Ligand binder design. Structure first.
Ligand SMILES: CCCCCCCCCCCCCCCCCC(=O)OC[C@H](COP(=O)([O-])OCC[N+](C)(C)C)OC(=O)CCCCCCCCCCCCCCCCC
Ligand SMILES: CCCCCCCCCCCCCCCCCC(=O)OC[C@H](COP(=O)([O-])OCC[N+](C)(C)C)OC(=O)CCCCCCCCCCCCCCCCC
Ligand SMILES: NC(=O)C1=CN([C@@H]2O[C@H](COP(=O)(O)OP(=O)(O)OC[C@H]3O[C@@H](n4cnc5c(N)ncnc54)[C@H](OP(=O)(O)O)[C@@H]3O)[C@@H](O)[C@H]2O)C=CC1
Lengths: 297, 110
């Protein structure tokens, strides 16, 4: 263990955490709060960005001087990935799209980019890897999202055998596409059952998967405390928000019930207590509003 | 007919500029912002003085509504009566302003 990567300090901003992290997909919704939580410990956080450097401004107050290194990367360029991961001791993958674009489909985003990141991270000697799949990833699933994400989970497992794959159910926060989707929809009620998980709980889970040495080669399923139906959840979101872009793949995933996987460990096996929706839903939906809580199952 | 075509063209150009001014920066996919004044949460305090200047405007505007046909009124064959009633209307506007003065009506918006 190198001398510069021994932890020092009281775990604050100006400390050294010993985590040298590369966070792919950090310019989005999970990478925002993950780079916040890594930078408040004093971690060297490499943020490979694909977008305009204007869109990485909000990440810059999140750490101390020199602690975030922004560098360019293309997903179809293995040289840029090796140029980004060859100094890390943990790699976090957060590349995702709710929609398939002209240059990238669900296959390239969920299979080719994670497998190339995991393979180049294997041949660069990175000790830990954290892959972020979805809870409802299935080969025979109705949505192309979850099909390619189950295939990418399989490939990340087979090409980086000590990867820590984490399954969130449906993450809610201020910048989500779950509660803000339901609040701006003004699609229907079915027998779909969900248990959403709060983003700070997911982020503390990813930190505790970085730090715990027993999380290598495991698979985690991050779910919230309360299973809800779809209809009473959507009416609760319309009720808290004081209310009377979409695609068919998103609608088929909203109507996908959140599966229960008790054989996989969760937040409570990482020391994270899942915050319920009834503490944070007003924090999410206070922006939308110009209340009896929802029924559980 | 030409007047209505002109008004309709002006309204159409104004509506088109407003529609472009509300839709062209909404083409951007900038960011959805979270957590979107001197007085914080008080009600609006009613100022009597602003109501008084609005009512004084309305009454003097009615006196002006009486005053408007004078460029046609000078053309009459009863000029003594016309001149007397014209000076009498402007004098009644002056008496209304003088009474507004002398009863502290024009105070702190003088
Ligand atoms: C008539 C009087 C003058 C009117 C204005 C001048 C005329 C020109 C009007 C069009 C100018 C170009 C489009 C608007 C500016 C785009 C700025 C921008 O942020 O672009 C990125 C944006 C969004 O890019 P994005 O999807 O990567 O999002 C960036 C934000 N993040 C990553 C955080 C989510 O692109 C667009 O909105 C595309 C708009 C259409 C592009 C032009 C089409 C043909 C026009 C002829
Ligand atoms: C206060 C009132 C001041 C103005 C008084 C009238 C001045 C005037 O020229 O009147 C002649 C005018 C007009 O008289 P004239 O002699 O010009 O009439 C000519 C005839 N015509 C109009 C058909 C061309 O008014 C009258 O004679 C009748 C109306 C006024 C009657 C008296 C009102 C007294 C009010 C007291 C309060
Ligand atoms: N509720 C949720 O969001 C859930 C998410 N997940 C998974 O978590 C991860 C992150 O999700 P989330 O933050 O919410 O989604 P976002 O869309 O907000 O973030 C995706 C990130 O990946 C980047 N990215 C996307 N496509 C590409 C590409 N082709 N090449 C390079 N970079 C790319 C984006 O950068 P840029 O802006 O520059 O394009 C952004 O940094 C994904 O793997 C997703 O599958 C799992 C369960 C639930």
């Amino acid at each position: 263990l190198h001398h510069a990567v021994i932890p020092h300090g009281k775990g604050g901003r100006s400390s050294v955490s010993g985590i040298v992290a590369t966070v792919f997909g950090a310019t989005g919704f999970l990478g925002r709060y993950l780079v916040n939580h890594l930078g408040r410990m004093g971690s060297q956080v490499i943020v490979p960005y694909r977008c305009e450097p204007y869109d990485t401004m909000h990440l810059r107050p999140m750490g101390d001087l020199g602690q975030i290194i922004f560098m360019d990367w293309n997903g179809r360029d293995k040289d840029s990935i090796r140029r980004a991961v060859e100094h890390s001791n943990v790699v976090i993958n957060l590349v995702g799209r709710e929609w398939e674009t002209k240059n990238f489909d669900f296959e390239d985003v969920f299979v080719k980019i994670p497998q190339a990141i995991a393979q180049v991270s294997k041949e660069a000697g990175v000790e830990k890897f954290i892959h972020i799949s979805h809870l409802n990833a299935d080969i025979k699933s109705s949505s192309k999202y979850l099909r390619n994400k189950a295939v990418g989970e399989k490939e990340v497992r087979e090409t980086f055998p000590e990867a820590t794959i984490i399954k969130p159910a449906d993450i809610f926060g201020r910048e989500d596409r779950f509660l803000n989707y339901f609040a701006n929809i003004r699609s229907l009620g079915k027998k779909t059952v969900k248990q959403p998980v709060y983003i700070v709980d997911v982020t503390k889970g990813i930190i505790n998967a970085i730090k715990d040495p027993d999380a290598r080669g495991k698979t985690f399923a991050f779910v919230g405390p309360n299973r809800y139906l779809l209809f009473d959840l959507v009416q609760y979101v319309f009720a808290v928000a004081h209310r009377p872009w979409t695609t068919r793949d998103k609608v088929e995933r909203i109507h996908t019930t959140d599966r229960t996987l008790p054989h996989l460990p969760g937040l409570e096996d990482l020391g994270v207590q899942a915050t319920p929706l009834e503490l944070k839903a007003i924090e999410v939906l206070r922006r939308h509003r110009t209340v009896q809580p929802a029924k559980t199952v | 007919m030409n007047l209505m075509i002109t008004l309709l063209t002006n309204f159409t150009l104004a509506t088109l500029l407003v529609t472009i001014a509300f839709w062209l920066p909404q083409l951007n996919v900038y960011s959805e912002k979270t957590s979107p004044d001197p007085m914080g949460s008080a009600r609006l305090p009613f100022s009597m003085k602003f109501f008084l200047v609005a009512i004084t405007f309305l009454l003097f505007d009615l006196e002006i509504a009486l005053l408007l046909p004078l460029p046609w009124a000078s053309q009459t064959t009863n000029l003594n009566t016309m001149l007397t009633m014209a000076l009498l209307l402007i004098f009644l506007l002056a008496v209304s302003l003088a009474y507004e003065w002398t009863q502290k009506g024009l105070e702190w918006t003088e």
